[PDB]
Amino acid sequence: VADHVASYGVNLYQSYGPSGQYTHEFDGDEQFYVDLGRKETVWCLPVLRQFRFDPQFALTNIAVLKHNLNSLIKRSNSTAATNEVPEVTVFSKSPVTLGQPNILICLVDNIFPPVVNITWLSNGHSVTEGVSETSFLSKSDHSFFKISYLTLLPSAEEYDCKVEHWGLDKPLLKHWEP
Amino acid sequence: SPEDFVYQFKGMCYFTNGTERVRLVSRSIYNREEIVRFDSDVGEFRAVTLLGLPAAEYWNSQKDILERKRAAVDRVCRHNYQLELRTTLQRRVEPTVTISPSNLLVCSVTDFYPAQIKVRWFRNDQEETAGVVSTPLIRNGDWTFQILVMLEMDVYTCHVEHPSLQSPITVEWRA
Amino acid sequence: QPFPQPEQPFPGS
């Protein structure tokens, strides 16, 4: 037990199509993540934008995991991952007032392996405007959880959260209403 | 459901009493099983399972990696903590306490960082011990926390203490 | 400025 906990290096590399993620976490929250494609560091806390972190470190470090993962595949006689069942919950950030604006929060927990599709829906139609997701955030049991957001001004005739994961027989939908 | 092989490396730091107690733990993980780790309190790579035994022996053999990993407690954990003291550890968000009925009274604490809180329910200046149910600490993910403390039921007061607050906020509900 | 923790390579594969 400690007063504060930080993961100065959450390194993730899986075989489902070389999928890589490099993040830094402090007290369970995401400080920044390195986009391995654009080779850019994206800070999630505005006060942390003053610092600088070379995106090249993430690329070279992920390449080490790539070597390591392929080594453990031969050693463990190709022991694959176990698809856990996700736990999804939908809630709002602020108290629901039909005029004021609020953000809907769809928290998906127990995500292993780190492969998931989180899609917001509104009366059977897919919503793409005003959505944003967080990186795979690590857990003590070495699983992950992901949070997707949807900004909206709530109203009486106004959502569902579609989660697609291999630990599910069918796509799971959690409904939200005012 | 195709076969997926996952590998993780967590370079984690543990802090207690500020900078007085600092512990460095780096975990190398295959799927969900940590195979080899380095604890700053043991000072050497030790395997957790047999899969990490070749790596722990090879890394302990390279005295250059050992020398630089023992120093990582200061160069990583203690160094980056001085950056947290000027940024994240200074972040203070005052909570927003609103009361709304849902027989049931719900006091909603919505936007506060850090996570330390203590919410009490009062019924005519006498604290209500039983009959109160509170949700767990809800992590919003955007460096804010929320909690919902609910109460089944003259004047009812929601007592909320927080480190960012000098004196607790006492929102009240009646009728 | 944030100092990171690297992962060491496994031997022989």
Epitope: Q56, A63 | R75 | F10
Partner: T-cell receptor
């Protein structure tokens, strides 16, 4: 990043102290020294960090200010004639080479 | 730790292209390519990246120094359309982990380009 003497002279059996100037050194920066014989590549000799270290080929002295560092070779022999580089950085990517100090060992 | 460079020595004519190899006995994180002219300082060319594009230093372009790294233990540096300026000793350095202080250098590749 580092400033070191251009060249030095010494006789065999003498302690040689090459002093490296590394002002503007970061707290997490590490001190490294290399020895390159002619036609060959540089060879790592000693490594230090806010801590004077002593090894077999040599010893490294690190002042608390960390604004400077000094490599000490005891009982220098004819075979120690080489170019000595002073490298200061955090990671391996931060290791840039300079002009070095050309040390000649006379008999 | 132990590095083997194939082109220990070679003499090429102008306009030709030569490929240098850098093979390491052990698995290493970092792999660099250096260059040292007859009487000059050791200039860093680029950093070989596995599965990505090489990180070239200022002045060095991928068009003249194409670099590939198929595995962590093997890299290839090519000098295309050679000119007499290229005549140099091409070194490849190696770091086991990115947080090591010891760089292992190879024995080198002596190059002399002639008009």
């Amino acid at each position: 990043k580092t400033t070191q003497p251009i060249s030095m002279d010494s006789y065999e059996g003498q302690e040689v102290n090459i002093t490296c100037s590394h002002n503007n050194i970061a707290t997490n920066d590490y001190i490294t020294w290399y020895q390159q014989f002619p036609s060959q590549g540089p060879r790592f000799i000693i490594q230090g960090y806010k801590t004077k270290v002593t090894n077999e080929v040599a010893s490294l002295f690190i002042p608390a200010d960390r604004k400077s560092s000094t490599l000490s070779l005891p009982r220098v022999s004819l075979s120690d004639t080489a170019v000595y580089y002073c490298l200061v950085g955090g990671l391996a990517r931060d290791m840039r080479f300079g002009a070095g100090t050309r040390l000649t060992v006379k008999p | 730790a132990v590095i083997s460079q194939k082109p220990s020595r070679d003499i090429c004519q102008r306009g030709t292209s030569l490929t240098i190899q850098c093979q390491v006995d052990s698995q290493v994180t970092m792999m660099f390519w250096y260059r040292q002219q007859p009487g000059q300082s050791l200039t860093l060319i680029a950093t070989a990246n596995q599965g990505s594009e090489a990180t070239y230093e200022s002045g060095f372009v991928i068009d003249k120094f194409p670099i590939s790294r198929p595995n962590l233990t093997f890299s290839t540096l090519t000098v295309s359309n050679m000119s007499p300026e290229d005549s140099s000793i091409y070194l490849c350095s190696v770091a086991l982990g990115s947080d090591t202080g010891e760089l292992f250098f190879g024995e080198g590749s002596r190059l002399t380009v002639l008009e």
